Design a protein around this ligand. Structure first.
Ligand SMILES: [Mg+2]
Ligand SMILES: [Mg+2]
Ligand SMILES: [Mg+2]
Lengths: 22, 552, 497, 139, 136, 139
């Protein structure tokens, strides 16, 4: 007989940066 | 029955011909020399009645029928699901030239791109082979019912499996009236105009009309027992024969109903009236006819030969009632309305933000006509080009998604975007251009007569002294805004409440030893309210807005 | 013997449910009328609704309502917890649910109840696994198809209805969506009467004051308060009595009398479960601890206590009250101390938030956190929210030429729309304290967001004397000392100095 | 243990929770300690996986629901409560959250007495100075 | 500007592949400044998208021989912000500088399928409007 | 080793740790070596993946709990101690943080003598000057 399974691998995020000018 | 369904006369005729001609006289198809197809798909929004029409076709057709559904095919025993589908097809052939209907194919169509299990892939391949294995002389047609067309295995779209599809869309208002009538014959009708109810009903589709009808019926039933005081003992026949759902029930049901598509994005019922928006008379009129013509006289637009404008931007300094105009429009538009705030759509997960923009515009197109109010559009429309690396191009992606979804509004489905920003200087020059967002309404500082109108509109509910003169106030307050006047009135009200509480505690002490000593506001209250009254207008900001308006 | 007696009182009748009169009655009609007077629905022509969705914050008695209806109705009842259906075996969870529905139909007309549907309706579009999507498809098929429902009604309970598949939120599957929100003051009064009629209370019991002083408790919160009070009383009396593990005399069992001191102490040591995450221990500051600012103290006290104590007068004139206020002046003048005092005496809830605390390195969580905080504030209203140093979070949008990633501009836009937008604006008061009012955006200081611009000037000699008395109110001092000289000698100093 | 329940099989974790609770109620009037809840309550909103929210729903049902508890008391331990679902922090599920913070000099003295009772100390040693000079020790 | 990371160059690569496959063709690049924006002024970027797009455009336009006879047409409002590395000889050297009669012809072409009033002349609108454009 | 226990599959890395510790405590009094914990100690607050929190919690439970250890000792190895969860740097889990820095010139001489005992060099060359020339060369 067969069976099922759950799976959760990863995702993708985005970061935010601060800059300094001159 | 076949006539039971309605609102989609063209599609019902198409499907009826498609199902009857290869089933009533297949011999003529052989004589002409065309092999009729075996697979036929219908796709549309939820509640359109696809299952209803399929059931009616199963009923009105004398030929034998069989129903299959996606989630009941797979089974614990290995390889037994494929055998189940195979034996289903063998019985479909062996019994008679029947018609087989598979419900919710999307459960058995994971696009084979995100599909990872081996049993699911096997079942998909088995069904693909069986469909391809349906010879010309099979003389049995399969009918597929998909709720969403994008999550479909492209292999199923190939010729020989599913060539004829029908996008059963939301019915016309006249079709909506026809469906309402279909619901309205069985029930006991009061003496009195479903045409008006359909002309005012805009976003509801199919089952939503049934929901409205049921809700009105329930309200009618609710008034009856409470007045009759009917108890658990028994029902009174005099009540039973005296039953007719009136117009007021339908008013109540419409006031307590919303389209199933918008059920998630319902909005708080805040009430505003056209007399609450003091001043801005020309603005109020121009907005109302601009909203009323495309929604009531589509033929007039055709006669003119120029489609109406779609976007608009309200701009001005804060406290000029722009959000108040948005509320008033949301209250009195006779159409759907979705309020959207800028930062709400953004999401950290990469792509999700644009997905949210896409789905919100999907609902906007679904519940057409609609009025999407984007408050503080600047948060989205930040001018760029030197940002370089900061947010992560995600803001640029959002702006690109909004731009591509704002120019892609065809003549159909007539969706109006209302913008509201305080500082238009930061908006992207692209969006402000015509073709995507053309109209620009400017909300100047109120005139003195407009100021008086605003003042009178804010004290509509407040009991007032008989000998109250507001002309002096207007002559004094020259550069103020509606919010400033609201602050003045609230200060006066607070002073009055303080006096009333003082008098009430004095009277309570007297009792320990009229009800309202100040039933209305007094002139002294206004005198003290204006002692602490100031204007939030920044003269420099005024100059900047004037310069921008001149540049316009 | 006791089993029969226990069963009778075990069931919680409809009278047990309180504070939700309108919604409870509506659902009672929906469940009873087709099972008490079906004939009217055959005579009128139309069928009744056969689907209901309960939604609201937790501990709102929705599960209590399910138990109450199950106890009241004599019809068959089927109970299904949400995650309970699935199993390791392939294709058996849907088989199990189908078997459940078939059994429900086979036996009698029945009411199915599916608890925590949010785990079972993931919208079938954002998930990546197919088992959930096929379970959703199976539920949709059972709710819609040949013989979709046959004289059986389905009740569902949820906490996040917006994370549900739109097809499940449609007429024909779930016709009515009931919103059981925070109970009103009267509702809390009935809840208190329900929870206080069982145990024995002393004659000093007066529930009206307790219902008035509670501001955000819903259901179980109130029950918890009651329990805590009782336990405190038990601790007051389990101390005077010895350990006595063998048995306790009736005289201690009798004359318990949960005093008002117990109730007040338990209310002072409790808070609504909503604010349980954000609240912190607060220092104590008397009004006499705040020297000077007499007119400002009275103005703020009346402007906060009037909507909460005198709402009838507001409806008499039918005008909304002022909400915001912004103090500004030189630092250390006593602004933050005044805010602490307001937190200590005022009855309304206090939400203390630091200025740059809420900023995030990720994308969009600043505005999401602002929305979450503001939702919490408007949920458990009346509330007092203190924004310390608005110039840290509020600036003129776009002023800084150097790119910040747009975070600050988007945050300020979120603030603007929350202080003035499509808001209910019932009972939320924004208090600001900044010593540099030039850096704040001109829109925030507008009336309708921040209508009161209060300047806190330097104290005078009499105010310095008042402050000296306030801070010398505890420490012992010289009888021969007169502070008049100190006042005559201090001119430019502040309270902190 | 906290992560002891999570498994590769779909739904078996909740089955394990059901078995645990049913055995606990079937055996005797028991006390159930669930350790390190910070890994089994990710607020149901910041997380993206499906199994964890399902486990959270199972736990919420176990704590409150039809005949939720009878002669069973649940105690939990965690190092960060702010990263917990509010639905678990309500009366009926988790009535009261007790805090265990930094002891003072006297508290440090009892802890020192506890920890210095079994070894052979010198006669010239005292615990008062040690309890005073020790400031930030968590015991 | 493909959302997929790095694909912002593959889009231009396969656009020029579709151009060179169906030779001859005309690639009308509208609003060149938005694409080129020059280089150097803003050293940083969101993954150097700008500089990578300009380098892809230069390396997929300078590789055009006498075969495949492609032709790039540009148009802009601001000619100041175009890259001199793309205005160089050997890549794109032509400079076409772009009235009343054109305004009258535009007004007569816009009013083709329109029931106009017979007593109406558009020469007044042509003479009154001088520095206008077809969109307005 | 550090990254070899991680499993993207749900609830399997924890099982791997369970089997590892069970075998470790089954055989005999044992010494365990967990290489590169910095891949399994992101402090549970910065990273967004729930799997890291779950593995950290499982490690904490294994290193601390009811009848945690019996006659075994655990040692860790890392290059970035500052990027570690403070709950892992506690007495009873990892009490002794030993440092290993660059050896002295004498250390270089000793290492060379270790390296040049099995090979064969010439007489003329000495290792003292060679050790002195090797200033920062480590291991
Ligand atoms: Mg259907
Ligand atoms: Mg419950
Ligand atoms: Mg301060």
């Amino acid at each position: 007989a067969a069976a099922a399974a759950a799976a959760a691998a990863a995702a993708a995020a985005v970061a935010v940066a601060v800059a300094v000018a001159a | 029955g076949y006539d039971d369904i309605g609102g989609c006369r063209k599609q019902m005729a198409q499907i009826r011909e498609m199902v009857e001609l290869p089933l009533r006289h297949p011999q003529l198809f052989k004589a002409i020399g065309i092999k009729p197809p075996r697979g036929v798909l219908m796709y549309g929004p939820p509640g359109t009645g696809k299952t209803l029409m399929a059931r009616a076709v199963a009923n009105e057709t004398g030929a034998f029928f069989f129903l299959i559904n996606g989630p009941e095919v797979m089974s614990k025993m290995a390889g037994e699901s494929e055998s189940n589908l195979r034996k289903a097809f063998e019985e479909a052939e062996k019994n008679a030239p029947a018609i087989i209907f598979i419900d919710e194919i999307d459960s058995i169509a994971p696009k084979r791109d995100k599909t990872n299990g081996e049993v699911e892939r096997r079942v998909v391949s088995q069904l693909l082979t069986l469909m391809d294995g349906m010879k010309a002389r099979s003389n049995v047609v399969v009918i597929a019912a998909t709720n969403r067309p994008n999550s479909i295995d492209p292999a199923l779209r190939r010729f020989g499996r599913f060539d004829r599809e029908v996008d059963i869309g939301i019915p016309d208002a006249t079709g909506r009236l026809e469906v309402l009538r279909i619901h309205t014959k069985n029930m006991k009708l009061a003496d009195d105009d479903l045409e008006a109810l359909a002309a005012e009903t805009h976003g509801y589709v199919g089952a939503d009309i049934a929901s409205l009808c049921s809700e009105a019926a329930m309200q009618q039933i609710r008034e009856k027992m409470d007045l009759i005081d009917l108890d658990e003992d028994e029902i009174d026949a005099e009540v039973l024969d005296s039953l007719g759902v009136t117009m007021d029930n339908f008013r109540f049901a419409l006031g307590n109903s919303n389209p199933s598509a918008l059920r998630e994005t319902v909005v708080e019922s805040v009430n505003v009236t056209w007399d609450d928006v003091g001043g801005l008379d020309e603005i109020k009129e121009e907005l109302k006819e601009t909203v009323e013509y495309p929604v009531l006289h589509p033929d007039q637009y055709t006669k003119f030969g120029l489609s109406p404008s779609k976007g608009v931007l309200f701009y001005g300094p804060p406290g000029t009632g722009k959000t108040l105009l948005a509320k008033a429009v949301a209250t009195e538009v006779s159409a759907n309305f979705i309020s959207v705030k800028g930062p709400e759509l953004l999401s950290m997960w990469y792509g999700e933000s644009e997905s949210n923009i896409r789905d919100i515009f999907d609902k906007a197109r679904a519940a057409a006509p609609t009025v999407v109010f984007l408050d503080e559009l600047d948060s989205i429309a930040k001018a760029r080009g030197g940002s370089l690396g900061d947010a992560g191009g995600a803001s640029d992606r959002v702006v690109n998604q909004l731009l591509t979804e704002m120019d892609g509004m065809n003549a159909k489905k007539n969706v109006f975007v209302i913008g509201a920003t305080n500082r238009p200087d930061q908006i992207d020059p692209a969006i402000l251009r015509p073709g995507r967002l053309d109209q620009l309404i400017y909300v100047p500082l109120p005139d003195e007569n407009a100021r008086l109108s605003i003042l009178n509109a804010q004290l509509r509910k407040t009991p007032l002294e008989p000998g109250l003169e507001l002309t002096a106030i207007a002559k004094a307050t020259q550069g103020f805004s509606g919010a400033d006047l609201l602050y003045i009135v609230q200060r006066a009200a607070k002073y009055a409440i303080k006096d009333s509480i003082e008098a009430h505690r004095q009277h309570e002490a007297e009792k320990e030893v009229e009800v309202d000593p100040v039933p209305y506001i007094t002139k002294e209250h206004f005198a003290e309210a204006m002692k602490t009254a100031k204007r939030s207008v920044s003269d420099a900001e005024l100059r900047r807005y004037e310069a921008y308006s001149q540049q316009m | 013997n006791r089993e029969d007696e226990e069963n009778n009182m075990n069931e919680v009748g409809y009278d047990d449910i309180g504070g939700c009169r309108k919604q409870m009655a509506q659902i009672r009609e929906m469940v009873e009328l087709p099972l008490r007077h079906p004939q009217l629905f055959k005579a009128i022509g139309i069928k009744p609704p056969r689907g209901v969705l309960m939604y609201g914050p937790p501990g709102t008695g929705k599960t209590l309502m399910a138990r109450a209806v199950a106890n009241e109705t004599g019809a068959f009842f089927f109970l299904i917890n949400g995650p309970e259906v699935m199993s390791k075996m392939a294709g058996e969870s849907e088989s199990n649910l189908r078997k459940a529905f078939e059994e429900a139909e086979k036996n009698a007309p029945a009411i199915i109840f599916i608890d925590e549907i949010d785990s079972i309706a993931p919208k079938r579009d954002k998930t990546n696994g197919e088992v959930e999507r096929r379970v959703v498809s199976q539920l949709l098929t059972l709710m819609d198809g040949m013989k979709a429902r046959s004289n059986v009604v389905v009740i569902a309970a949820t906490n996040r209805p917006n994370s549900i598949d739109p097809a499940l939120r449609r007429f024909g599957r779930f016709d009515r969506e009931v919103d059981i929100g925070i109970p009103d003051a009267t509702g809390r009064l009935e809840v208190l009467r329900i929870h206080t009629k069982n145990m024995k209370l002393a004659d000093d019991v007066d529930l009206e004051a307790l219902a008035a002083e509670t501001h955000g408790y819903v259901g179980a919160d109130i029950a918890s308060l009651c329990s805590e009070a009782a336990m405190q009383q038990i601790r007051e009396k389990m101390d005077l009595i010895d350990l006595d593990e063998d048995e306790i005399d009736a005289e201690v069992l009798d004359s318990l009398g949960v005093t008002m001191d117990n109730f007040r102490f338990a209310l002072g040591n409790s808070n609504p479960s909503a604010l349980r995450e954000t609240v912190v221990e607060s220092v104590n500051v008397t009004w006499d601890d705040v020297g000077g600012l007499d007119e400002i103290k009275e103005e703020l006290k009346e402007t906060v206590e009037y909507p909460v104590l005198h709402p009838d007068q507001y409806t008499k004139f039918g005008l909304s009250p002022s909400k915001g206020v912004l103090f500004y002046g030189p630092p250390g003048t006593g602004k933050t101390l005044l805010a602490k005092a307001v937190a200590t005496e005022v009855s309304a809830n206090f939400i203390s938030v630091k200025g740059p605390e809420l900023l995030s390195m990720w994308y969009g969580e600043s505005e999401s956190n602002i929305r979450d905080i503001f939702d919490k504030a408007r949920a458990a209203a009346p509330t007092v929210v203190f924004l310390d140093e608005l110039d840290s979070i509020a600036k003129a949008r776009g002023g800084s030429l150097g790119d910040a990633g747009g975070a600050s501009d988007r945050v300020v836009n979120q603030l603007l729309t929350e202080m003035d937008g499509m808001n209910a604006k019932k009972n939320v008061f924004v208090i600001g304290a900044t010593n540099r009012p030039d850096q704040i955006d001109p829109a925030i200081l507008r009336p309708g967001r921040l209508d009161q611009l209060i300047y806190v000037p330097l104290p005078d000699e009499n105010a310095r004397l008042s402050i000296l008395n306030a801070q010398l109110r505890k420490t012992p001092l010289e009888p021969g000392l007169e502070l008049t000289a100190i006042a005559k000698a201090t001119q430019g100093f502040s309270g902190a100095d």
